[PDB]
Structure formats: structure tokens, C-alpha cells
Amino acid sequence: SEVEYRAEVGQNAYLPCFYTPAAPGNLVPVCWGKGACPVFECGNVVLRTDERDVNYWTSRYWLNGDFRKGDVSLTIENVTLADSGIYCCRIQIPGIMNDEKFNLKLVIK
Ligand code: NA
């Protein structure tokens, strides 16, 4: 079968996502959203690293990796059954013409 990530209710979920940063160590940012990656964006935004982002410090969505170095892996804390589904991790470096799209499948039981 196909690639899966799992967590039990209450646990943290760890969904991997990487890209190659082309310096000067500036935020070439991520769109993390609920749903398979659509054509242009990243679905229902869960964490978007720009100026439109709101209430980061209170949400359950974390970039606890070395993201300036390209580790934009998501950690969702204290997961529920509702958190099951597909996540889109999209890297728009503008920058480069071809976006980096990743669908990550999370299963919660
Ligand atoms: Na957060």
C-alpha cells in the first residue's frame, strides 16, 4: 500500500516535509493545509509562514524543525480523530518556477 503516518488520540503527529533552501537564509515559506495539494495553494490553511498567519503561539500546528535549513516538517500536538486526513505541504520559492508539493496521509485512531 501507500505511505502513511499515524498517531493515537492525544499524541503528537509528525508529518515530514523538506526542501533545499537557496540562501541568503531568508524564509522561502511553507503552506501547510488540510486536503490533497490543489493546483495553486495548499488547501484549508493550517500553518502558513507569512504575514497573513494568525495566532501562531496558540495553535496546535508547529514547525519545530530547522526550517531556515529546509526542515519544514509539521508537528500537530494533542491530535483528535478529526485531524485524520491528507495534508498538503507546499513550498513556493519565488524564486523557482516549479513548486514543491507533498501530500502526507495522517491516520488517527
Ligand atoms: Na502553533
From Swiss-Prot:
Variant or mutagenesis effect after changing T80I: In SPTCL; uncertain significance
Residues binding Ca(2+), per UniProt: G95, N98
Tissue: Expressed in T-helper type 1 (Th1) lymphocytes. Expressed on regulatory T (Treg) cells after TCR stimulation. Expressed in dendritic cells and natural killer (NK) cells. Expressed in epithelial tissues. Expression is increased on CD4+ and CD8+ T-cells in chronic hepatitis C virus (HCV) infection. In progressive HIV-1 infection, expression is up-regulated on HIV-1-specific CD8 T-cells.
Description of post-translational modifications: O-glycosylated with core 1 or possibly core 8 glycans. Phosphorylated on tyrosine residues; modestly increased after TCR/CD28 stimulation. Can be phosphorylated in the cytoplasmic domain by FYN.
Annotated ranges, domain Ig-like V-type: 1-103
Superkingdom field: Eukaryota
Residue stretches in coiled coil: none
Location within or outside the cell: Cell membrane; Cell junction
Annotated positions binding a 1,2-diacyl-sn-glycero-3-phospho-L-serine: R90, M97
Ranges per topology, Extracellular: 1-109
Disulfide bridge positions per record: C17-C89, C31-C42, C37-C88
Stated consequence of mutating I76M: In SPTCL; uncertain significance; affects protein folding; decreased localization at the cell membrane
Function: Cell surface receptor implicated in modulating innate and adaptive immune responses. Generally accepted to have an inhibiting function. Reports on stimulating functions suggest that the activity may be influenced by the cellular context and/or the respective ligand. Regulates macrophage activation. Inhibits T-helper type 1 lymphocyte (Th1)-mediated auto- and alloimmune responses and promotes immunological tolerance. In CD8+ cells attenuates TCR-induced signaling, specifically by blocking NF-kappaB and NFAT promoter activities resulting in the loss of IL-2 secretion.
Disorder association: May be involved in T-cell exhaustion associated with chronic viral infections such as with human immunodeficiency virus (HIV) and hepatitic C virus (HCV).
Self-association and partners: Interacts with HMGB1; impairs HMGB1 binding to B-DNA and likely HMGB1-mediated innate immune response. Interacts with BAG6. Interacts (phosphorylated) with PIK3R1 and PIK3R2. Interacts (not dependent on its phosphorylation status) with FYN. Interacts (in basal state T-cells) with VAV1; AKT1/2, LCP2, ZAP70, SYK, PIK3R1, FYN, SH3BP2 and SH2D2A. Interacts (in activated T-cells) with LCK and PLCG. Interacts with ILF3; this interaction promotes ILF3 ubiquitination and degradation.
Family listed: Belongs to the immunoglobulin superfamily. TIM family.
Name of the protein described by the UniProt record: Hepatitis A virus cellular receptor 2
